[PDB]
Design a protein around this nucleic acid. Structure first.
Ligand SMILES: Nc1ncnc2c1ncn2[C@@H]1O[C@H](COP(=O)(O)OP(=O)(O)OP(=O)(O)O)[C@@H](O)[C@H]1O
Ligand SMILES: Nc1ncnc2c1ncn2[C@@H]1O[C@H](COP(=O)(O)OP(=O)(O)OP(=O)(O)O)[C@@H](O)[C@H]1O
Ligand SMILES: Nc1ncnc2c1ncn2[C@@H]1O[C@H](COP(=O)(O)OP(=O)(O)OP(=O)(O)O)[C@@H](O)[C@H]1O
Ligand SMILES: Nc1ncnc2c1ncn2[C@@H]1O[C@H](COP(=O)(O)OP(=O)(O)OP(=O)(O)O)[C@@H](O)[C@H]1O
Ligand SMILES: Nc1ncnc2c1ncn2[C@@H]1O[C@H](COP(=O)(O)OP(=O)(O)OP(=O)(O)O)[C@@H](O)[C@H]1O
Ligand SMILES: [Mg+2]
Ligand SMILES: [Mg+2]
Lengths: 592, 120, 240
RNA sequence: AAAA
């Protein structure tokens, strides 16, 4: 690259002395100047075509003269920023000098250099103020001309996608302006712990403009930034992933024994999905996924295909860590010597083989851990929950392998008989062994139920649990004990109904949870049933929780990392990787 | 494999079932009892096989330190799944401890227990 | 009054909270534990004041006779009200007792408990549940004895606890009896736990902040002020 | 508004 940009005023002789800045000359020079006739391009031309290898160009802003008006200044700033973006070298920051011209456009050029990057900002001065070519020629031969460099500047690494998304704008007028930087500057602080809630400490080394772009409210147009972010999913059911569509079709096709599968059944569809306008009951939601699951994943081939497709969806969503919930007993049968243990081992082997294969090729891979769902009073005798607990405990002892079972999952039907207060004798063993416990207590459960889940079962995470506001003591005990809560915005929005749900007034409490300090996390519940992966699940918070900011999204990711059932060393490694990747993307995603 | 290959040639074969010993250590890591119980519970679910897990053994020091009166909560799940319980009572088997093992641990087989004649 | 009058003149002040020790005597009047618990619960209701009751302490001789396997009935109410529980498991702390304190007593922060190295499962539970340990360097060094005290080859486990991920906080126990304040207690780690770094001291301070019995908003304000002051002092030290 |  190695390009000069300079501002030419009444005295145009600044360009040669700026050219002589380095001791080896430059390659290309472009000068932006106002439309006044005082500036003489002939002087620059006669100095310049003597070196044909140097490309020189002049850009003039039409309709601007002496920039004595505020509208004149804003138009000049817009035009100069567009010209800088157009002449922005593809890979290397350019050189820029601002010695010539009045304070107005010189300060504009300095601000542009800060905003879009500049390899070196320097100043040129001389004692005698040379006018003729031999004047500064003799000045530089003797050495009177001095080069003033106040320091290198790295600029903001990515603000050039505006060049990609805005046209060349050769024909412009007083209408096509982009106040996209002024709006961020105004909304910097136009609105306590939000400044100290800084996650991923490398966010501090971000440019201040980027730091406050992160402070701006999240909008639906941040889809690319959300997708590029490394994310964490902690509530992702294995079965409810390939429920309907092409994924279900290929899962059915990859069956080992296609004769026994039931390809006839199809699930009923709700109009407007996934942005449904009517509440759906929990049993209806479960029936929505009856196409996949226990009645289909009995055969080994379907289960392997579903696991592979789920991992592919996770890695394609840039999810760098996931905790998949599975119920191996639901896909087990003694007809072909397929117990729950071998089903769980198949899931674990598929996940670890996929992760190892992706890691050997040095590709982005999603570390996946498994949670064994322990349904209560599901298939008759209550021995099923004990069998699930024992299966999870024995699955822990595998030890060697990438994917491992880290915790168990619970689900109580309505109240009383299955809430939290009966199986402490069962869970004493599960706590001794080292498994973690998660509760699905989001079925309009009484605060006593959540209390028993917190204290009787020592649950480390809570599913949904959207009714914590009515019990301030419950909020206090959840925050104090650092008990994370996992909420799925799409599933909660569809099942319960939150504004802008038609004929609904309740608001999503995720923003209030974040303000109060709850270790909240955003998940997917069932990807296939809800029809929304993690990226759009995070994106919908712009409507479910108006006024949420990008810092809140990164705080949600940090809370997901903190509340994940992982060892401290692995958590530290994951935090380091997430911090580096998040800094990398945030550097190169504020471009748009 | 041994039982099947003995049956293939049609000779005398010893049918063998397995008991998972839930040993008492008390020198730390008391979760060994829970680990052994869970291992037995999920091992019995194998279904097939001439040899299969049929129950658990309450080995370890039979002293008052780790008698059968403390771990009914652990063994409720074991009884639920269908695993028989066997209790070691070789040394210092007080009659109350054996009674608790019979009635609280639901043991269907007592190891040794040579001092039953002292308690009619 | 002291904190308010320090804030009024806009100088450095030490926000203090109180823990009501649920002491044991066993020379009679066994209702002392219940009386202390009720007093702490009622005193939490004061509401106002910069200094407020935030929890209780299970101090006193920790012999097996009075372990944490009984008073769950007492402490259910104290957990309901919103008072944190700190277990003084300094001496004769068997792994079963600490486990009961963690799970049955719901202890949010343990006292001393220097023998977690021998029990791996207990360490893993303590790390995962994110419950702090209050080890006082000078007090443990004087009582238990560690290197470089003569005829004592036992190594202080603070460095290993920090490496493993334990939320360890350095304290004083008794400023007078031990004779060393918090600064000297942190300084002694240079020889008590050789190889420990200054960033580890900052980690200890951060763990002390994280495991303190404070509300989330106050914790965030305290963390912001601590970041400010730590940056200032580090810059001053590196520039001089 | 001390290279307009
Ligand atoms: N929102 C929920 N409420 C109660 N139970 C749930 C919920 N979501 C999942 N489950 C549990 O998951 C299972 C329902 O799905 P299924 O048995 O078919 O297999 P899955 O892997 O868990 O999910 P799916 O098959 O739908 O993809 C049940 O065990 C159920 O208890
Ligand atoms: N899905 C992932 N993709 C890339 N890196 C990951 C992923 N998940 C975790 N990591 C982290 O990257 C590292 C995996 O490779 P490894 O353990 O050999 O260290 P590393 O190669 O030096 O780090 P990196 O892979 O980031 O270059 C770990 O630090 C791990 O925490
Ligand atoms: N060690 C053993 N040897 C032979 N038979 C046994 C042995 N153990 C059990 N059996 C029983 O004997 C039968 C094995 O042989 P089989 O089933 O063919 O009937 P069988 O030949 O009439 O009896 P047997 O083998 O005693 O002559 C089974 O009923 C089996 O339960
Ligand atoms: N928990 C606290 N919250 C706020 N300020 C505190 C707290 N504890 C002490 N301070 C005082 O605030 C200052 C520590 O933070 P800092 O040095 O950044 O000053 P400050 O931010 O201007 O004061 P403040 O935080 O009250 O607005 C010290 O004066 C200290 O005495
Ligand atoms: N290591 C400990 N274990 C249990 N309790 C302790 C311990 N150290 C101090 N205490 C508590 O301190 C008190 C013991 O002494 P005392 O009752 O006279 O009041 P004190 O001022 O705290 O200590 P002292 O006056 O003896 O120096 C009791 O409340 C006791 O529970
Ligand atoms: Mg769910
Ligand atoms: Mg003390």
């Amino acid at each position: 690259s190695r390009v000069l940009l300079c501002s030419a005023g009444h005295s145009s002789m600044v360009v040669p002395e700026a050219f002589h800045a380095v001791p080896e000359g430059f390659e290309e020079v472009h000068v932006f100047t106002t439309d006044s006739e005082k500036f003489n391009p002939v002087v620059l031309n006669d100095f310049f075509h003597s070196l044909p290898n140097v490309r020189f160009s002049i850009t003039k802003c039409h309709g601007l003269a002496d920039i004595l008006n505020e509208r004149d200044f804003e138009f000049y700033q817009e035009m100069l920023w567009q010209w800088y973006l157009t002449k922005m070298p593809d890979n290397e920051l350019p050189y820029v000098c601002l010695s010539g011209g009045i304070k107005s456009m010189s300060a504009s050029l300095q601000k542009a250099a800060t905003l879009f990057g500049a390899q070196s900002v320097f100043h040129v001065l001389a004692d005698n103020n040379p006018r003729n070519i031999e004047e500064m020629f003799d000045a530089l031969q003797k050495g009177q001309i001095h080069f003033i460099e106040m320091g290198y500047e790295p600029g903001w690494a990515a603000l050039r996608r505006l060049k990609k998304i805005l046209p060349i704008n050769e024909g412009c007028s007083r209408d096509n302006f982009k106040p996209l930087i002024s709006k961020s500057i105004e909304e910097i602080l136009s609105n306590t712990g939000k400044s100290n809630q800084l996650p991923f400490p490398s966010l501090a080394i971000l440019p201040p403009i980027a730091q406050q772009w992160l402070q701006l409210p999240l909008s639906a147009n941040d889809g690319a930034w959300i997708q590029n972010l490394p994310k964490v999913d902690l509530h992702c059911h294995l079965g409810g992933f390939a429920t309907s569509g092409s994924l279900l079709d290929q899962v059915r096709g990859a069956a080992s024994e296609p004769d026994l599968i039931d390809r006839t059944f199809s699930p009923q569809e709700i109009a407007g999905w996934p942005r449904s306008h009517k509440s759906i009951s929990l049993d209806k939601y479960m029936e929505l996924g009856n196409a996949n699951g226990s009645k289909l994943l009995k055969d080994k081939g379907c289960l392997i295909r579903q696991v592979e497709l789920l991992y592919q969806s996770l890695v394609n969503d840039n999810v760098a860590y996931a905790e998949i919930r599975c119920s191996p007993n639901n896909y087990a049968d003694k007809n072909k010597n397929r117990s729950a243990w071998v089903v769980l081992q198949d899931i674990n082997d598929t996940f670890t083989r996929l992760i190892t294969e992706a890691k050997q090729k040095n590709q982005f891979y999603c570390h996946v851990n498994l949670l064994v769902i322990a349904s209560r009073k599901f298939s008759g005798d209550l021995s099923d929950i004990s069998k699930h607990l024992a299966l999870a405990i024995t699955a822990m002892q595998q030890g060697e392998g990438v994917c491992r079972i880290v915790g168990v999952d619970l689900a109580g039907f309505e109240n009383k008989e299955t809430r939290a207060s009966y199986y402490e004798h069962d869970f004493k063993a599960v706590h001794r062994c080292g498994l973690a416990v998660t509760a699905h207590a989001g079925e309009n459960d009484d605060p006593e139920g959540i209390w028993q889940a917190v204290y009787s079962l020592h649950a480390r995470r809570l599913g949904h649990a959207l009714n914590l506001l009515e019990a301030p003591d419950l909020m206090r005990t959840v925050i104090e004990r650092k008990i994370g809560v996992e909420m799925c915005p799409y599933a909660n929005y569809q099942i319960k109904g939150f504004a802008p749900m038609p004929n609904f007034s309740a608001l999503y409490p995720l923003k209030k949870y974040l303000e109060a300090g709850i270790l909240v996390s955003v998940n997917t519940d069932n990807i296939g049933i809800s029809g929304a992966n993690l990226s759009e699940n995070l994106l919908i918070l712009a409507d479910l929780c108006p006024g949420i900011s990008r810092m809140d999204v990164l705080t949600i990711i940090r809370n997901s990392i903190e509340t994940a059932f992982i060892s401290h060393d692995f958590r530290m490694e994951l935090l380091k990787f997430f911090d580096r990747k998040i800094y990398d993307v945030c550097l190169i995603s504020i471009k748009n």
